Design an enzyme around this catalytic site. Structure first.
Site, PDB file in Angstrom:
ATOM      1  N   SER A 191       0.829  -1.205   0.000  1.00 37.07           N
ATOM      2  CA  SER A 191       0.000   0.000   0.000  1.00 37.07           C
ATOM      3  C   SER A 191       0.862   1.253   0.000  1.00 37.07           C
ATOM      4  O   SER A 191       1.775   1.385   0.815  1.00 37.07           O
ATOM      5  CB  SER A 191      -0.938   0.022   1.210  1.00 37.07           C
ATOM      6  OG  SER A 191      -1.607   1.268   1.323  1.00 37.07           O
TER       7      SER A 191
HETATM    8  C1  LIG Z   1      -1.238   5.436  -6.195  1.00 36.18           C
HETATM    9  C2  LIG Z   1      -2.668   5.312  -5.759  1.00 36.18           C
HETATM   10  N1  LIG Z   1      -3.653   5.572  -6.645  1.00 36.18           N
HETATM   11  C3  LIG Z   1      -4.958   5.488  -6.340  1.00 36.18           C
HETATM   12  C4  LIG Z   1      -5.424   5.121  -5.077  1.00 36.18           C
HETATM   13  C5  LIG Z   1      -6.922   5.057  -4.893  1.00 36.18           C
HETATM   14  O1  LIG Z   1      -7.428   6.316  -4.471  1.00 36.18           O
HETATM   15  P1  LIG Z   1      -8.550   6.384  -3.318  1.00 36.18           P
HETATM   16  O2  LIG Z   1      -8.030   5.505  -2.203  1.00 36.18           O
HETATM   17  O3  LIG Z   1      -8.585   7.855  -2.976  1.00 36.18           O
HETATM   18  O4  LIG Z   1      -9.802   5.854  -3.974  1.00 36.18           O
HETATM   19  C6  LIG Z   1      -4.434   4.795  -3.996  1.00 36.18           C
HETATM   20  C7  LIG Z   1      -4.772   4.387  -2.570  1.00 36.18           C
HETATM   21  N2  LIG Z   1      -6.032   3.689  -2.387  1.00 36.18           N
HETATM   22  C8  LIG Z   1      -6.002   2.289  -2.009  1.00 36.18           C
HETATM   23  C9  LIG Z   1      -7.251   1.522  -2.439  1.00 36.18           C
HETATM   24  O5  LIG Z   1      -7.542   0.733  -1.285  1.00 36.18           O
HETATM   25  N3  LIG Z   1      -6.851   1.125  -0.207  1.00 36.18           N
HETATM   26  C10 LIG Z   1      -5.938   2.033  -0.535  1.00 36.18           C
HETATM   27  O6  LIG Z   1      -5.155   2.588   0.220  1.00 36.18           O
HETATM   28  C11 LIG Z   1      -2.998   4.906  -4.370  1.00 36.18           C
HETATM   29  O7  LIG Z   1      -2.011   4.639  -3.470  1.00 36.18           O
END
Ligand SMILES: Cc1ncc(COP(=O)(O)O)c(CN[C@@H]2CONC2=O)c1O
Ligand SMILES: Cc1ncc(COP(=O)(O)O)c(CN[C@@H]2CONC2=O)c1O
Lengths: 320, 328
Positions: free
Chosen positions: A73
């Site tokens: 993550s």
């Molecule tokens: C590089 C990146 N892009 C897009 C997202 C998705 O954006 P939102 O979380 O604002 O929808 C995340 C983190 N999100 C992941 C999705 O599930 N849990 C997380 O931490 C991310 O780290």
């Protein structure tokens, strides 16, 4: 957007750059919001959210930050970086969402940076109920004599999403007198960024279509999340339909597909831009296919919100 | 403004606004001394680095010659090669890279991951040599073989450290001086000293803008005796090209590149750990980690001219962490 306390992690507005070679190959004006080049530890979209989350944590006099996500993550990694920077302890509740045994997913990439940030790693089987699992750990940690502050999955609460509501003003200012947008494509995971951009761009950009390319869920499961958060943010701030495409994540969350991987190669060979296997690569695959299927309402300029994730490339190599 | 002849050199804008100059409160608290950081690791193109500044001039030069192929050399996990291939990709130019395994490792992550993995994504032609004994002649031999195919090649030396490439760090010095003006009275500057371009660029610039500020180059590959003339030759060439005299003595510490170039040491790893856990800043095993270890021990041994604030030039290098994991 103010009245909510906020720390300074970015300061300068993140670049908005034209992509000439990608626009060349696609035959369509493509723009990129470089939220991947935020100054803290290889960047990401979560800095925008943690500016509000950690500012709220300091008001409540916390000394420890607790969050959850996948082993790779970006959110957990960004949370750990900010915590280390401010002297706050950090506890991470991690899971293996894809069941791999590959050394690099288990130990490299974002997970390696966690060891460097001195993050207290807690392993669980599955994040079936993350809010209640964090709450448990928060009690255990406070029983150990700490003052913990829980941060939701991807920091995707109403307060968290305020970072991307603010982010819409940057886009409006950078696009004005330079480019007239038609569509904006963003990855939609825990819905924090997507809901945030929805409220902001509704007021700041009238004739633009926000598309959310999902990375973990179908439309049926993602609609209720993006709507609820949108109506929470609007209520919090005293202030439009959600658009979602769910074809571009193959077997699920945290697994690379051919379309997303080829999107990575495309923007690296043409633009020298680095995407990721999990989020942006799949989000770009929808953008490319959106032009291909003429899925956008018109053929005007499109903006891609680069939400980061590039450090994942080193963990997913060679395979998972 | 004694650096006004810098305008004579054609330049492509890769950075835009000046890079952050941040105070490091927790590290300052630990080391017992005011520590600042110049964040050239947060440059916008492909995970950043010091070489972007140098490429701004070198690639602009390449275009004025009508070249369509950038050729350069370094280690498999070279940060320069990676940044070069990223710029080449962004400008539709072919890139040929001459790479060596400088430590004789067989670890998968060093051979295939990190900077090397990114090279494949940028569609970089890879040429493996056994040892970079004479990088200038080897790059010439390669250039002929590449142009026989019909390419119009432009050769970039190791680390992009020509007098022209180094102009990107006379530029950096000017940023630094403007950002420090009436904000911080600097006493010392610590930078990694490899192929010498950054150090010499900073040497020339700082002598004319911050004459009382001491500049320390922590070597990452060579001893003082071997590194001194390399920095000086560039120093004097850069000065001559800017219609300037450079009388400042170059300063180098060689006590911190342990067994050799690209080989991690204990003091390096702890410097990496220290800044990650205290500041959320990511150093690297090869360059900034060893340069930080030199700063820490420099404070420890009272090696600087006085007790004043120290600026650390973060030149980048962080993608190497994933390559050097778990070991070499
Ligand atoms: C590089 C990146 N892009 C897009 C997202 C998705 O954006 P939102 O979380 O604002 O929808 C995340 C983190 N999100 C992941 C999705 O599930 N849990 C997380 O931490 C991310 O780290
Ligand atoms: C992060 C970082 N710091 C410092 C250096 C060395 O600085 P100068 O080359 O400007 O002295 C390099 C690359 N340079 C290495 C050193 O030798 N060959 C290379 O490619 C680098 O990637």
């Amino acid at each position: 957007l103010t009245r909510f306390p906020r720390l300074e992690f970015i300061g300068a507005p993140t670049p908005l750059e034209y992509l000439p070679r990608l626009s060349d190959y696609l035959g369509r004006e493509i723009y990129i919001k470089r939220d991947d080049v935020t100054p803290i530890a290889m960047g990401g979209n979560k800095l925008r959210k943690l500016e509000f989350l950690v500012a709220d944590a300091l008001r409540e006099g916390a000394d420890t930050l607790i969050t959850a996500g996948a082993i790779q993550s970006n959110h957990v990694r960004q949370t750990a970086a900010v915590a280390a920077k401010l002297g706050l302890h950090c506890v991470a509740l991690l899971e293996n969402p894809i069941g791999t045994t590959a050394e690099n997913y288990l130990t490299n990439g974002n997970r390696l940076l966690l060891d460097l940030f001195n993050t207290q790693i807690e392993m669980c089987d599955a994040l079936t109920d993350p809010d209640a699992q964090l709450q448990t750990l928060a009690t255990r940690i406070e029983a150990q004599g700490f003052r913990p502050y829980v941060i939701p999955v991807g920091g995707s609460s109403a307060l968290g999403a305020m970072g991307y509501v603010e982010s819409a003003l940057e886009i409006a200012q950078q696009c004005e007198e330079v480019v007239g947008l038609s569509s904006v494509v963003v990855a939609s995971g825990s819905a924090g960024t997507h809901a945030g951009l929805a409220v902001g761009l509704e007021h700041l950009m009238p004739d633009v279509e926000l598309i959310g390319v999902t990375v973990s869920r179908s439309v049926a499961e993602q609609k209720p999340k993006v709507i609820a958060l949108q109506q929470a943010i609007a209520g919090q701030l005293a202030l439009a339909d959600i658009h979602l495409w769910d074809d571009y994540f193959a077997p699920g969350y945290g697994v690379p597909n051919d379309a997303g991987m080829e999107a990575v190669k495309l923007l690296a060979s043409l633009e020298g831009v680095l995407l990721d296997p999990v989020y942006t690569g799949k989000a770009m695959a929808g953008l490319i296919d959106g032009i291909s299927q003429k899925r956008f309402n018109d053929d005007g300029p499109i903006l891609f919100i680069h939400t980061g994730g590039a450090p994942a490339l080193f963990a997913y190599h060679p395979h998972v």
